Amino acid sequence: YNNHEHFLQCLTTRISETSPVIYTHDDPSYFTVLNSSINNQRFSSPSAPKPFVIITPFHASHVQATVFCSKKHGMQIRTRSGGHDYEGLSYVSSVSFVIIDLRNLNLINVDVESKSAWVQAGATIGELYYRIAEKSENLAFPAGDCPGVGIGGQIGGGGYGYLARKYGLAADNVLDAEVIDVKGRILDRKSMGEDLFWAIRGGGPASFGIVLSWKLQLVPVPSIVTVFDVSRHMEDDTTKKFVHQWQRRADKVDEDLSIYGRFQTESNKKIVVRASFRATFHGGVDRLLQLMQKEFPELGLLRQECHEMKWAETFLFHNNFRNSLDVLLNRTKSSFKAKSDFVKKPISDDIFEEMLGKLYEKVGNAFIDLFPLGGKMNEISESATPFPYRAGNLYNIHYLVGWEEDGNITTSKKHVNWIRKLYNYMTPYVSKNPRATYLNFRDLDIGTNNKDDTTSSYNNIARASIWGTKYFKDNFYKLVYVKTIVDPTNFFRNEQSIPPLRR
Numbered sequence: 429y430n431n432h433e434h435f436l437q438c439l440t441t442r443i444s445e446t447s448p449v450i451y452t453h454d455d456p457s458y459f460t461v462l463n464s465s466i467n468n469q470r471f472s473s474p475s476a477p478k479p480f481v482i483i484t485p486f487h488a489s490h491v492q493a494t495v496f497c498s499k500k501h502g503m504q505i506r507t508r509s510g511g512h513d514y515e516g517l518s519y520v521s522s523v524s525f526v527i528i529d530l531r532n533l534n535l536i537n538v539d540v541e542s543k544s545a546w547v548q549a550g551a552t553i554g555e556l557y558y559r560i561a562e563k564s565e566n567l568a569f570p571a572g573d574c575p576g577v578g579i580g581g582q583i584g585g586g587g588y589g590y591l592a593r594k595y596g597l598a599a600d601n602v603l604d605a606e607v608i609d610v611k612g613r614i615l616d617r618k619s620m621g622e623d624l625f626w627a628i629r630g631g632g633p634a635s636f637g638i639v640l641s642w643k644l645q646l647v648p649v650p651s652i653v654t655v656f657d658v659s660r661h662m663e664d665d666t667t668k669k670f671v672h673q674w675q676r677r678a679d680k681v682d683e684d685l686s687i688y689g690r691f692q693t694e695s696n697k698k699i700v701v702r703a704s705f706r707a708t709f710h711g712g713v714d715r716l717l718q719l720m721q722k723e724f725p726e727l728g729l730l731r732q733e734c735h736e737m738k739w740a741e742t743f744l745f746h747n748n749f750r751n752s753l754d755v756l757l758n759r760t761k762s763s764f765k766a767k768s769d770f771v772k773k774p775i776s777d778d779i780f781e782e783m784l785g786k787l788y789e790k791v792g793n794a795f796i797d798l799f800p801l802g803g804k805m806n807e808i809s810e811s812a813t814p815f816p817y818r819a820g821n822l823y824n825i826h827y828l829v830g831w832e833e834d835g836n837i838t839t840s841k842k843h844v845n846w847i848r849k850l851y852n853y854m855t856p857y858v859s860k861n862p863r864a865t866y867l868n869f870r871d872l873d874i875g876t877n878n879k880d881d882t883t884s885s886y887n888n889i890a891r892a893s894i895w896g897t898k899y900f901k902d903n904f905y906k907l908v909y910v911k912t913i914v915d916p917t918n919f920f921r922n923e924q925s926i927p928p929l930r931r
């Protein structure tokens with residue numbers, strides 16, 4: 429049926445090849461290209477699905493060529509920017525597929541005077557922050573703190589970080605974009621239309637096309653911002669009461685302050701729960717300390733725990749570069765299962781302790797992170813982008829268990845079973861109808877698409893609404909509309925792709 433030799437002929441006659449663009453199985457570099465941006469090591473096993481070829485475009489025509497031949501020869505495309513997909517959806521598929529790996533499409537053009545930047549979709553967050561800092565210490569972009577994450581995927585799913593309470597998600601700060609649609613057309617915001625421009629900014633662009641570039645609204649930051657990354661003992665009542673106050677106030681304090689939490693256990697053996705709190709305050713240390721005295725005296729934050737620095741240098745601090753130049757952010761690994769939830773009402777202290785108690789089963793390799801919402805996030809409409817979890821959401825909670833990848837599926841299954849049990853435990857206390865899920869914390873467990881029988885688009889939409897309303901609440905229905913208009917034959921699909929309505 430799908431002749432892979434004809435497909436390869438199609439590729440090589442439509443992609444001229446002197447930089448290497450097409451990587452085949454017998455190419456030794458095929459595996460390093462493949463492996464180099466697999467972040468979740470579960471999916472790097474030789475027994476994980478493997479692309480027939482990997483395409484590293486240098487030019488849009490390479491992408492257009494790939495879309496043409498993949499359509500013509502029945503190949504599925506997986507687009508990869510930073511490779512951080514929790515479930516590896518950018519480089520695994522259960523059908524014959526090619527990866528379009530955008531690592532060479534990482535040009536960034538920052539313009540200080542317009543406070544904007546064109547960013548090719550293969551750039552990483554660290555590359556974006558470096559390029560902004562190159563030009564201004566007073567400009568920023570609201571995105572995440574992991575420097576190796578691809579900007580294509582992070583904005584494609586929303587993009588939260590320390591500036592979100594001040595300026596919203598990365599997706600809330602996109603002025604324009606370039607995308608390749610299923611017809612191979614290069615479209616920007618005007619030519620793609622507002623609805624597709626909406627969908628790719630948080631709706632999972634893999635469902636709709638291939639984003640080549642974003643035009644980003646840069647945002648102002650003071651020359652001095654303050655960070656801390658503070659460890660506390662959850663056995664101390666003041667730390668328990670801090671967490672109690674964090675649940676009720678972290679989304680309400682001064683928008684310039686974002687305090688994340690992280691809980692883990694630590695090791696006659698005694699096991700304890702370490703509670704770590706890491707923050708960026710977009711301002712000076714004296715304002716921070718008096719804010720913390722008013723709002724969170726329970727943390728006992730010390731002036732000596734605070735560190736003032738330029739905005740871009742906080743991503744050194746928050747990635748444990750505390751000895752190093754900003755150039756470390758130009759450097760573009762374990763297996764894990766992660767799950768997450770949005771919290772809309774504070775979790776009573778006893779339940780919170782019980783949830784923490786589950787970490788006693790996974791000392792040192794399981795982590796519960798808390799991320800505050802509110803602030804600017806409450807002022808953004810639930811339909812402004814596909815990300816719907818704005819006002820009414822207090823914080824996001826993120827569960828993660830990690831392990832060394834040794835190709836042992838029994839190890840994997842135990843960890844996944846543990847995290848699934850914690851997630852089930854959490855069900856009554858987190859959002860419901862839908863169980864709010866951040867798309868960038870991708871979780872196939874919340875539901876996937878029809879694979880066996882995809883002939884009824886009514887049934888596809890119904891099945892997809894299960895995971896779809898969890899990621900997007902009522903934005904799911906517009907996403908379906910956009911999918912219907914922009915990719916009616918459903919060329920761009922994966923395990924959790926928006927399905928089109930069909931006749």
Ligand SMILES: *Cc1cc2c(nc3c(=O)[nH]c(=O)nc-3n2C[C@H](O)[C@H](O)[C@H](O)COP(=O)(O)OP(=O)(O)OC[C@H]2O[C@@H](n3cnc4c(N)ncnc43)[C@H](O)[C@@H]2O)c(*)c1C
Nearest residue numbers: 509510511512513518549572573574578580581588634639
């Ligand atoms: C591993 C990791 C993830 C993080 C980290 N920190 C984050 C943070 O501080 N804030 C966040 O909001 N999210 C954080 N994340 C999560 C990442 O944002 C998500 O995991 C992103 O989806 C990852 O994006 P990327 O690194 O580009 O991963 P990919 O696997 O390449 O893509 C994910 C997904 O999106 C599709 N896609 C990517 N790029 C495109 C383009 N250009 N066009 C269309 N579709 C695209 C992929 O096909 C896939 O479906 C910190 C860490 C360590």
Ligand SMILES: C=C(/C=C/c1c(O)cc(C(=O)OC)cc1O)CCC=C(C)C
Nearest residue numbers: 572573588589764797799800823824866
């Ligand atoms: C800053 C957040 C991301 C944090 C994050 C993290 O701390 C660790 C990892 C990770 O090591 O995986 C391997 C991945 C991550 O995404 C985004 C929160 C989203 C909300 C508030 C809707």
